[PDB]
């Protein structure tokens, strides 16, 4: 189809390891963004067929979304917090580079990113 397989969310051979930063990323950062009124366009992978988004996957090489991030955190997929932070950054970058400035989707992304950056500024050491 026009859509790729969704990003992997589990690593069956990675040992389980918790960090307080990963706990914060799930229980504070992801939870806060997930419950925000503007979360809905970002809660699942972009479906370029259903959304009629021409060339989305020609332009966006590394799709990412908060449903994938949520599952990765729940499944202890990330070895470290910085991998998770990178996924959030990629999600926002994809939106800003594909869509036109001032499209509603971009303004929603910016509100979520502002909240994200606020919480990251309090990331535990
Ligand atoms: C990251 C990113 C996302 C998107 N849109 N994502 C969407 C758009 C719409 C919906 C929706 O459910 N609408 C909806 C709202 C109310 C009643 C029923 C329905 N169906 C879900 C996701 C675009 N375009 C560009 C983009 O870069």
CA atoms within 13 A on the CB side of 25: 26
Distance from residue 18's CA to the centre of ligand 1 (Å) = 33
Residue 100 DSSP class: P
Distance from residue 124's CA to the centre of ligand 1 (Å) = 33
* CB-CB contact of 81 with 25 (8 Å): yes
Residue 94 CA: nearest ligand 1 atom is: 27
- 2-38 burial code (b ≥16 CB/10 A, e <16): eeeeebeeeeeeeeeeeeebbebbbeebbeebbebeb
Distance from residue 17's CA to the centre of ligand 1 (Å) = 34
**Which superfamily does 20-121 belong to?**
Bromodomain-like (1.20.920.10)
Structure-token pair, residue 104: 């509603």
Contacts of 35 (CB under 8 A, 6+ apart): none
- 62-92 burial code (b ≥16 CB/10 A, e <16): ebbbbbbbbebbeebbbeebeebbebbebbb
Residue 44 CA: nearest ligand 1 atom is: 22
Residue 56 CA: nearest ligand 1 atom is: 27
Residue 40 DSSP class: G
For this entry, resolution in Å reads 1.3
């Amino acid at each position: 189809s026009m859509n790729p397989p969704p990003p992997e969310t589990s690593n069956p051979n990675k040992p389980k390891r918790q960090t307080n930063q990963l706990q914060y990323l799930l229980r504070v950062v992801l939870k806060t963004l997930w419950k925000h009124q503007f979360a809905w366009p970002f809660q699942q992978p972009v479906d370029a067929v259903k959304l009629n988004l021409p060339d989305y996957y020609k332009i966006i090489k590394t799709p990412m979304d908060m449903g994938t991030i949520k599952k990765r955190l729940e499944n202890n997929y990330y070895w470290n917090a910085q991998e998770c932070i990178q996924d959030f950054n990629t999600m926002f970058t994809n939106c800003y580079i594909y869509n036109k400035p001032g499209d509603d989707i971009v303004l929603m992304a910016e509100a979520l990113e502002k909240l994200f950056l606020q919480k990251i500024n309090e990331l535990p050491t």
